[PDB]
Amino acid sequence: YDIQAWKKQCEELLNLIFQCEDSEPFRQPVDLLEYPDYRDIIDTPMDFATVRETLEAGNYESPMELCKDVRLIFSNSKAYTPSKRSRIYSMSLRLSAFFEEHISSVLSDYKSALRFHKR
Ligand SMILES: COCCNC(=O)N1CCN(C(=O)c2ccc(C)o2)CC1
């Protein structure tokens, strides 16, 4: 029933993601010299360094907010990909499965802890 526990859980999940080769494309911003049309397709860039920095700045109130930004990384990859069999998109889908597998308990425990606080 620890209402704060999600934050370290998210820090340790981001550490796992940063160790994962599938996160390589999603750590830092997209260079427009390399993808000149990226912002013609993607309105709101997002990457795992920005998620980690937002977390470490104390600028997430809940793991749901972190989960919306992580999911935006994946939806951007799906929107930008020219093919569902692209290398970078294919890395996004595996990383997304890994992230959803690990975040499900973090969200559950947080919401459980809030409910207990409100009881
Ligand atoms: C080493 O990473 C450098 C920073 N990252 C990127 O440059 N990008 C990551 C995001 N992204 C895509 O999701 C995507 C889908 C299909 C294709 C071709 O790219 C565009 C490339």
The string over 36-75, giving b where at least 16 C-beta atoms fall within 10 Å of a residue's C-beta and e elsewhere, is eeeeeebeeebbbebbbeebeeeebeebeebbebbebbbe
Method: X-ray
Resolution (A): 1.2
Determine the angle formed by the axes of helices 48-56 and 6-19, rounding to 10 degrees: 150
Give the structural domain span for 61. 1-119
Our count of domains for the chain comes to 1
Contact 113, 5 (CB under 8 A): yes
Whole-angstrom CA distances from 118 to 3, 107, 111, 114 are: 11, 17, 11, 6
**N-to-C CA span, the chain:** 12
Atom of ligand 1 nearest to the CA of 38: 20
Alpha-carbon gap, residue 42 to 64, rounded angstroms: 22
17, 34, 35, 84, best to mutate for ligand 1 pocket (most atoms within 8 Å of CB): 35
Q: Which two tokens stand for residue 5?
A: 């526990």
Which of the listed residues 20, 44, 77 should we mutate to test ligand 1's pocket, taking the one with most ligand atoms within 8 A of CB?
77
CB-CB contact of 48 with 14 (8 Å): yes
d(CA 42, CA 47): 13
CA dihedral 49, 90, 94, 28 (to 10 degrees): -10
d(CA 51, CA 19): 15
Number of C-beta neighbours around residue 6 at 10 A: 24
User: Which residues touch 28 (CB under 8 Å, ≥6 apart)?
Assistant: 47, 49
The tokens of 74 are what? 């994946």
24 alpha carbon – ligand 1 mean position (Å): 9
